[PDB]
Amino acid sequence: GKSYPTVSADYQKAVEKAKKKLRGFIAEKRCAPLMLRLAWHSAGTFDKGTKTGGPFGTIKHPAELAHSANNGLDIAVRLLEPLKAEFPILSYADFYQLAGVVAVEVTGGPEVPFHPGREDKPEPPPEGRLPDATKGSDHLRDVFGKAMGLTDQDIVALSGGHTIGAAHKERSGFEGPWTSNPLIFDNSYFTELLSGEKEGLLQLPSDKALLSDPVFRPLVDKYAADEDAFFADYAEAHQKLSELGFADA
């Protein structure tokens, strides 16, 4: 149910230019996982019943960066500020979601469709909407389903974002990468989840919840067996995530 707004030709030119500069910047800085996290924490605050939160640029506000869920994302915001300044016509809202799309692309992931037009809104949402890594399936459905409005399939596929990156004990308190190749976007997150705990690799309680839930586990199995299937479902889910509350909800 998306009706994307019209933007000027100059806006579209800046999107295309920004997309290329973001590739080079994110690849050079090796910061794709952090940028994916920044885009996801931007979007993941959307509450469908109130139409508040969502990918509308508020994460750059000190009040939202201060949310404990967002520990470390001020680094992300700061890294992007010089490049953002080369594209004054773009909203921050669009710029951060574009960075998330590019982060997935430059690590070898699917090409997530991107539509411009998000406005930068004045009020950040209240703290507390992002998921708690220590809880399980009911909690994930509360947050992704009841608040954001995403499907069970979306929850499993988007969990596969942890195929890149790592936790840091000084940010969340968890520590280490989920995969042996944490700058490579692939289905390894699910293959590690199936195989048991391997030394040095991370599994959060929220990751493990996917293995015991009757709806989530067949999705984990599909994705571990079929990377192409993972990529298709991932791209659908990331696009939906990046567009919550935008161009209709």
Residue list, annotated binding site for heme b: 40-41, 162, 166, 168, 172
**Interatomic CA distance for residues 16 and 86, integer angstroms:** 13
65-89 burial, b at 16+ Cβ within 10 Å, e below that, comes to bebebbeebeebbebbeebbeebee
- The answer to the question of residue 26 lying near ligand HEM (CB under 6 A) is no
Residue span binding ligand HEM (CB under 6 A) among the ranges 6-14, 21-29, 90-98, 160-168? 160-168
167 binds, among ligand HEM, K ion, none (CB under 5 to 8 A by kind): ligand HEM
Which of 18, 25, 26, 40 is in the footprint of ligand HEM by CB under 6 A? Answer: 40
72 contributes a contact to ligand HEM by CB under 6 A: yes
Are 28 and 20 a contacting pair, CB within 8 Å?
A: no
The residues, any chain, with a CB within 8 Å of residue 88's CB and separated by 6 or more, are none
* By the rule CB under 6 A, 106 interacts with ligand HEM: no
3-state helix, strand, coil in the chain (%, to 5): 55, 0, 45
Residue positions in the annotated binding site for L-ascorbate? 29, 34, 171
Q: How far is the CB of 126 from ligand HEM (least distance, A)?
A: 18
Binding track over 135-154 against ligand HEM, x by CB under 6 A: -----x--------------
- Which residues is 177 bridged to in the sheet? 166
Backbone angles phi, psi at 166, to 5 degrees: -155, 160
Which residue in 41, 61, 67, 139 is the catalytic one? 41
Q: Which is nearer to ligand HEM, 56 or 87 (CB)?
A: 56
Q: What's the CA gap between 216 and 160, in Å, rounded?
A: 12
Among 37, 60, 118, 141, binds ligand HEM (CB under 6 A): 37
Instruction: Check if 139 is active-site.
Output: no
| 198 C-beta neighbours (distance < 10 Å), count | 11
Of the pair 40, 56, the CB lying nearest ligand HEM is at 40
> Which DSSP helix (H) or strand (E) runs through 233?
helix 227-242
State the residues that interact with ligand HEM by CB under 6 A. Answer: 33-34, 36-37, 40, 72, 131, 133, 140, 158-159, 161-162, 164-168, 171-172, 174, 204, 206
